[PDB]
Each structure stands twice: as structure tokens, then as C-alpha cells.
Design a protein around this nucleic acid. Sequence first.
RNA 1: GUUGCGUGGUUCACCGCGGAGGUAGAGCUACUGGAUGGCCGAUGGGUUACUGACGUCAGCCAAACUCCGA
RNA 2: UGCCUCCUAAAAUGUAACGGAGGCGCCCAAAGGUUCCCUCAACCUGGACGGCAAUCAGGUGGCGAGUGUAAAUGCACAAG
RNA 3: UUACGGCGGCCACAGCGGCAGGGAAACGCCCGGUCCCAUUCCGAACCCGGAAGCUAAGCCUGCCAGCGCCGAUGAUACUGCCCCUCCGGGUGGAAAAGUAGGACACCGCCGAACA
Lengths: 134, 119, 177, 178, 57, 77
Amino acid sequence: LIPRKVKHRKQHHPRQRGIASGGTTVNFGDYGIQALEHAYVTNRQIESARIAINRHIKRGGKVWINIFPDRPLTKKPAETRMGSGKGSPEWWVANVKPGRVLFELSYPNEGVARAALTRAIHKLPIKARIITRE
Amino acid sequence: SVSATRRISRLRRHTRLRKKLSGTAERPRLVVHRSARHIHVQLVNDLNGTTVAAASSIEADVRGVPGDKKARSVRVGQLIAERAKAAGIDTVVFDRGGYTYGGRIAALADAARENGLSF
Amino acid sequence: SNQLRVTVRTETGKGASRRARRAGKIPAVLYGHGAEPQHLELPGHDYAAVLRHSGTNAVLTLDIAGKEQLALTKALHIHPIRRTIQHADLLVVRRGEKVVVEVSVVVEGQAGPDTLVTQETNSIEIEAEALSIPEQLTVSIEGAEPGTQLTAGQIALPAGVSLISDPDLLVVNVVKA
Amino acid sequence: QPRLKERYRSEIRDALRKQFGYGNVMQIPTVTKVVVNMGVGEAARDAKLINGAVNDLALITGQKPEVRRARKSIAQFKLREGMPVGVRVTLRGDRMWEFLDRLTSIALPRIRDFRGLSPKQFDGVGNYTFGLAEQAVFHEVDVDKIDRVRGMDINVVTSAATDDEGRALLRALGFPFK
Amino acid sequence: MKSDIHPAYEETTVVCGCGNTFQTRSTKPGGRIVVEVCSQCHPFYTGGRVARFEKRY
Amino acid sequence: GASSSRNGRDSAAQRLGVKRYGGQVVKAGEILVRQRGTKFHPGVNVGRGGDDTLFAKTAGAVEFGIKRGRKTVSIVG
RNA sequence: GUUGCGUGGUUCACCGCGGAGGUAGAGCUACUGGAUGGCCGAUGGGUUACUGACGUCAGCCAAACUCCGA
RNA sequence: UGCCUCCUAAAAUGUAACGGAGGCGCCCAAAGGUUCCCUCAACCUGGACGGCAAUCAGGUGGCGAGUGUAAAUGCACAAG
RNA sequence: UUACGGCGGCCACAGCGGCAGGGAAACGCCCGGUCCCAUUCCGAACCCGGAAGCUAAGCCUGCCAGCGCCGAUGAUACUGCCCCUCCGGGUGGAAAAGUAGGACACCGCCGAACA
Ligand SMILES: [Mg+2]
Ligand SMILES: [Mg+2]
Ligand SMILES: [Mg+2]
Ligand SMILES: [Mg+2]
Ligand SMILES: [Mg+2]
Ligand SMILES: [Mg+2]
Ligand SMILES: [Mg+2]
Ligand SMILES: [Mg+2]
Ligand SMILES: [Mg+2]
Ligand SMILES: [Mg+2]
Ligand SMILES: [Mg+2]
Ligand SMILES: [Mg+2]
Ligand SMILES: [Mg+2]
Ligand SMILES: [Mg+2]
Ligand SMILES: [Mg+2]
Ligand SMILES: [Mg+2]
Ligand SMILES: [Mg+2]
Ligand SMILES: [Mg+2]
Ligand SMILES: [Mg+2]
Ligand SMILES: [Mg+2]
Ligand SMILES: [Mg+2]
Ligand SMILES: [Zn+2]
């Protein structure tokens, strides 16, 4: 995942403070992964947690990703003193506040879908949990 | 419609010159309202919105004046000239009302300068 | 059916709503047919059980210091992390008024061929009077072919109940694979 | 008094009340303006329209037209802003009825292999627009004393509300339709 | 602008070869416009292979 | 080191803003709201100025208000 | 900062009253951009399992976005 | 390396870094003064050559166009 | 006092739209281009001289929450200052969104009809 344009190539770090206010409930699917703590979730971490939900159900189902990495982070070159400018962009971060639902899932069986979302919490740099549509 | 266009296009010309011409208690504003049959006139004093004097062609004095519609404009110009001097007014600002200065409104103002008012 | 005992709030603010929640109470308001709103506490664990069962609409019979009054449950406020009721809005009903209520929609059936049954909402807003004849509205998909999308029409709505959401809400969609 | 206007208030004015049930006589349609333009797009190159498109609509319609300038620049047409591309004349009153008469009587049956104007050319409101292909339709220009041929399209704006209400008006004035 | 810019627009007698005539106002110098076809002498104002076989045979 | 001083420059801050607030007695000629454009508009006894400076014409107290959406600065004489 | 000579509560704090704001938060069919899943489908590509503009229904994001707004 | 605009800048003003973006060393004898008048872009339908888009006519359109030149604040009452 | 004509205050709780009704004086369309005046072309507009026709439209009045607009109480976010290792707590302020609802404006002066 990567955007096709951004208006500003070099941005500040998005601030990691506050309980989330939007996307706090499961809207598309029946099961979902809710965050519990602040972290930057990069596009490599989403595509790794996506292919761990897909390759455990192996057919059927539908997987929603209502989180997109559109905020860039920058990186200096390797052996460099401080302060000759700001570095070129390297990573792509989606700011994840506590309470935010990351992945969602509709699947007919309960124990397979719940044991597939656990295999994506172990790929993400947060503490998380599985919540249901009531 | 040709009637809805003329009403909006004249209260837009009238609000244009209203930005720069107000009228006060020592210098009122001689507003005109020209229609096809008659013309009206009133001094308005835009600080409290209170007409101090008015005149028109719908009353029986102007109705009997012989001549055309310019000739009935001179008579209503002479009336508010001697209805403003009966209330302590000798200088006013003039208000076209959105209309073009000329013809009947110009004959109203030329009849109000020769009878006391000093704009 | 749902007997429930409330009390009127002494002090109303940020610090007193926190002291009510640590004592096992839920703060709420009761605004209705033009009257002034009451500011009242809920008993907590009892209110969480008279809407876990008996649906979520769940016409309540309040006991405001002796006086009796019926009320619906308009809107809750759930904390995103504790997942506990913070604050309720209740509105009164005098034995039949055309209120607006969102209600559950379930799906009954199994599709035969390679068909993925997808749904876009679990609720439609229907109007009805007091003590709730309506409940969840079953949509019997018989196992149709994956080309037929089910709209807000072709719904099995009961009598005395009108559908006033929109007659184009896609509720069940079936596609290939 | 032009002969098509006094014919308009003699039988065309009353036959619209039987055909369309108007309650009041101010609802009867009447053509308001006839707008004629060339649209000489071959003037971004070589800029010659002075004796071309101005001194022939003066002979056809009756008065001097308006040299319309461009609004925006288009490079594929080699057109820059503020450059003469159109020549418009607007006909009102007595010169309008003397043009709609002189069109249908002596001009419009001189289109080469003419078989009728299309009655589908209304714009959803009741305003009619058709086109021509040459200047020699009108007898007021002589073909020996002109430059290159050029055509015109003609609007006829009516007070009618809908299409067939405006189609019935121009049918009685003398427009052919197929 | 409505003074010695516009061309001469005087009354003009129009005739046709059919015999129709009327009288309007046009820019033709002289007042003697003569047409050869009008709105009353022109058409449109006044109105298989199997059959070809037996015509041969 | 990559010489990324492609953008290292700024203008000078122009000290804009409101200079005399409401209910504050002013003299004749005192500048009330220095600004770019007409963020504030001239009302009674307030002139605009050449670079939209909104000075005072008459001594009195300053009061703000609304006049058909555009907000105004006026002086009670 | 000190000190001489002037001026004398003009300073400062709190309560009351009159004032300008665009931060935190929040919102976005209120704009400029980013963007997830549906429905409809302009074009494009081989009669159309590929492309999915513009709209529309739910859920979102922004130091250089703001109808709002402590 | 001086001047000009934004953000950083924490809702007055001010505020640093080899922090994030761009402009300037002009042009206009009307693109200045004044007086009077006008409303746009985009889209929909109709139209000879005419095309996605020249010019024309009619609908819908409250500012999405426009401002000599960068951005901000402005401007439809118009500063267009 | 009024299914009246002006001028303002106010700038959507007032705008937009739909549906009915209205013509005493007025307002309007309208009938004409000799006269001052007028169109980058046109008596369309601006202007002048008129009073044959009509409430069809503008305008005015009544009724509609449909699209817009306004909008609490409560609660949460945020936060000044204190207590705190963080989490959080005490005291003082308090939104945005949403919900209940509001709403087809209200007020002053002059003229004309009634009185
Ligand atoms: Mg949000
Ligand atoms: Mg600056
Ligand atoms: Mg200067
Ligand atoms: Mg010293
Ligand atoms: Mg205060
Ligand atoms: Mg404040
Ligand atoms: Mg800002
Ligand atoms: Mg923020
Ligand atoms: Mg967008
Ligand atoms: Mg999409
Ligand atoms: Mg912001
Ligand atoms: Mg500041
Ligand atoms: Mg500050
Ligand atoms: Mg440079
Ligand atoms: Mg000039
Ligand atoms: Mg200008
Ligand atoms: Mg009458
Ligand atoms: Mg006329
Ligand atoms: Mg009517
Ligand atoms: Mg509140
Ligand atoms: Mg609100
Ligand atoms: Zn003939």
C-alpha cells in the first residue's frame, strides 16, 4: 500500500496522544481487531498481517482493511552528521490510536475466524484484541 | 420575465449608490420612485428611518396640471421644496433611486433647486 | 415487563458523573413531548440486563421517586475501550406515537453455488407506535443465484409498521467466488 | 405595417387558443427575437472578415452586426483571446417580421435540393435553430461581388413554454417541416 | 448608432414568375427584387425488384 | 552532506492585527486594526486607508459589530 | 542592576464588565488533497469475467485543509 | 547572505535551526483618477462547416471563475 | 384597521421550492418611437410620449418540513491550576458532531384606502 500522490512530501511526525474517536466500532464485518496502544503501523506490517488472515481461511470470507498508510516518515543517509536538511521519505505510516479498528472479517465459522485474527495481532507492533459486532 | 428582471436590476443599481450616499438629520435624502404613470418623492433621514416630508403625483394638486409627464414632475418638485422649508431643511442629498439621471427625475431636481433647496 | 428503579441526580457535572459510575450508576436524561428534561441516574447492572435481553429498544417502565413513566432508549454512548455504558438518552411514549426506531436485520438461508453473501447494513429505520410489536426483520434468502441484489423493498415488514429509511438500501448482496 | 405581423394578430393569435386551452390572452406565444450569426472561425488566421462577414449580414438582415471577440484561447484551433471570430445581428420589432417573412417566402425555398427543415431542432423550451450553407439564398447579395462562401445559423426565440407549443407557432407563420 | 451607420432599408416591391407578389421592406437598391421561385410555386409546399422483372419479361 | 538549503529563507513579520480593542477610548487618527485586505470593514467614523489600515476619524470609544456578514469597526462619538 | 533628583499608586493581584482570535479537540455532500468497502457505469482493452470516470450509500485522515471551535 | 508570502509558531504581537514550500531586482501612458453600467466558471438541450473545447440561442448556476506577477488575507455590495 | 404602494433596520428561525387565491387607488406587464436620450448590433435594456388589453408573470396574502438554515439539556473529548511514578484523581471552565425540538420571519416611519 502506497498513495499515488501526496500534497506534502515531508511532514512532521503524527502525534501519538489521545483515545481515538472515529472508527472505534466494527462497521463492515462481523469480527475485528481493536488496537489498545499507540504505534505507527507501516505498510509492510499491514501486508504481512493481511497475508496471515488470507492464508489461514484459504477460501471464502471477506477481509476489510479500514486503515491506510498515507503519512510518510523520513530518513537521513547512513553515515551523516546532524543537520544538512531533512531526509528523503522512506516509510509509510498509518497513525493508530487506541480504540481504532484495524482489520475486519466476515467468515461463517467462529473458531477459524478468531484463530485467524490472532495470527495478525502477532504481526503488528501493538497490543490488541478481537471484538465482535455485539 | 421582463418584470422580474427590471425589479432586481433597479434595486441593485439603487444599492450601488446607497454605499456612498446616506442622508442625515441636517441633510436628508430626496428619494425618487419613478413608475410609468406617477412619480413619488420622500426625504428619509437614515439614522432612525423616519420620513420628514413627502410628495407624489397621486394627489389632486398634481393631477390637474396640464401637460405631459415632465410637466407633472415640475409640480411635485415645487411641493417638496416648500414642504421641506416648512420643516427646517435647506440642503439635501439627491437620490436617483437606481434610475438614470435624466428626463423626469432631472426635471424634478431642476424644480427643487429654483425653489429653495441647495444641492 | 422491564421494571426499573431510578433516582434524581443531586449535582450534575463532570466530577459527579465520575462519582456515580464508581458507585455503579449510569447518568442519563429523560426528554420528551416538550416537557423539561429530567436528570436521573440508572441502577447500573440492572440497566445492562434489561437491554442485553429483550432487544435494544426495550420499552422501560421507570419509577421516578414513586411516579411512573414509560420511556424508550434513544441513544447510548459506549466507551471505545472499556466497552461499558457511559450515558443514555431516554424519550417518553404515551401509549402509541409514530416514533422512529432502527431495528435489527438478520439473514436466513444458505446459498447453493459459489456465492459470497455480503451485507451493507444490519439495520433499517422503521416507524411504529408504543410497546414494540416489531423485532428483528428476517430476510429469507432462499439460496438464489449470485446476481440478485436484495433492496430495502421485498422486505417482510409486519402490519402497522412503515418503512421510512429509503426504498433503495442494499441490505444483502450476493456475488461470485 | 409588415404583412406577417398583421397576419399574426388576425388568425394565428386566435388559433392558438383553440389548439391550446389558455385561460388568459397574455399566455399566447410570440416570437421575440431572431438572432443571426456567421461564426467565422477562419479569422484567427489572416484576420479578414471586414468586407466578408460584416458587409453581407448588413445586406441580408438589415442593420450592421456585432463583431464578437473570443473568450478563451484555444491552441489546437490557433485561436487567441480577443480575436474576432463571430459576427452577430439581433432583429427586434418590425425588422424581425420583415425578416421572417422574407426568409420563408423568397429565401428559404432556394436551398439547393430543399425538402424541409427538421422539426426536432427545438431546445426543450420552444426556441428554434437551423442553419444555412451559402449567402446566395438571399437575393440582397450578388454572387459576383463577394469573397469566399460562408454560412449562418439562425435562432428564433419564442415566448412559448414547451416544444410542441412553440412548434405550433412557427407552423402557422410559414416554416416548413418534414 | 442608429444614425448613418446602417445601410438603406426602404420599401421594396417583390414579384415572382408565378404571378405571386407582396410588398415589404428590404435593402435591395432600386425596389425591384424579382425572384423565380416563391413560397407558392415551389415543391414541398404543394405536394421493388420483383415488379421490375415482369416489365422486362 | 546533501546541501539541502534549497529553502532557508523568510520575510519579516509585519506586526499586523488588532491594535485598539473594544471599549477603549481613542484619539483622532489612531490606527485601530492594521491588516492585509478588509478582514475588518470601516463603519461609522472610521476610514479605510491606503493599505487597509482602518484608522480613526473622531475621538470616542471603539466597538465591533456585524453589518450583513462583513464585520465592522465603528466609533461612538 | 544601583544611585541622585522629580512624579505619587499610575505597577501588580483578584472579582465584575466590554473586546479581537482560529491553537487543542472535532468535522468534512463546507472547500483543496489523501483514501477503504458497496451500487450504478462514461470511456479503454479482448459480442465483453478486464479498465472503473462522474455520481450515490455507509466508515475515515491532514503542520502548509476549515462550515465550526474551547 | 538583502527584500516579499505561507507553515513550523503553542487561537494578540514576537520567536530559532544547513527546518518544510515558493517568489523578487519588474511590468502598465492605461492595467492610473473619476462617472455610469454589467455578472462569472462548470454543466444540460438545440445549432452549417464545428471536433471534448471557437461563435449563437435557451435553461440550471451565490461564487467552484477572475485579480499584470508568488503565497496569504481579501473581493459577487464587487477590488472581477 | 386591511389578499395596498414606498423607504429602511435586520441578513436564512427570514433563503430556495411547491400548492391555491388576489386587482378600488397604487405597483406591474403592456401600446407606440414625433420629442431630450439610448445600444461594442437591436426603442430588448436605458429614455420619452401614452392608457386599447390583462392579473398570465413580477408583487402581495394564505397553507405545506419537502431541500436548506437555526438548535438546547445531558454526557464525552479538550483544558487553567493543584495532588500524582505512570494509569489516573480533586477543583474551576467546557466544545464539535448527534438527538429532543424550533421555524414558511419579526420591527419602525411616510403615502393611499377604511374610519
Ligand atoms: Mg473523525
Ligand atoms: Mg511572514
Ligand atoms: Mg500604494
Ligand atoms: Mg539608569
Ligand atoms: Mg471576559
Ligand atoms: Mg474568548
Ligand atoms: Mg492556520
Ligand atoms: Mg488535531
Ligand atoms: Mg473529496
Ligand atoms: Mg470507490
Ligand atoms: Mg488544523
Ligand atoms: Mg501569533
Ligand atoms: Mg500564543
Ligand atoms: Mg531563489
Ligand atoms: Mg479606465
Ligand atoms: Mg473593475
Ligand atoms: Mg386597478
Ligand atoms: Mg417597446
Ligand atoms: Mg395568478
Ligand atoms: Mg451544552
Ligand atoms: Mg451543534
Ligand atoms: Zn411563384
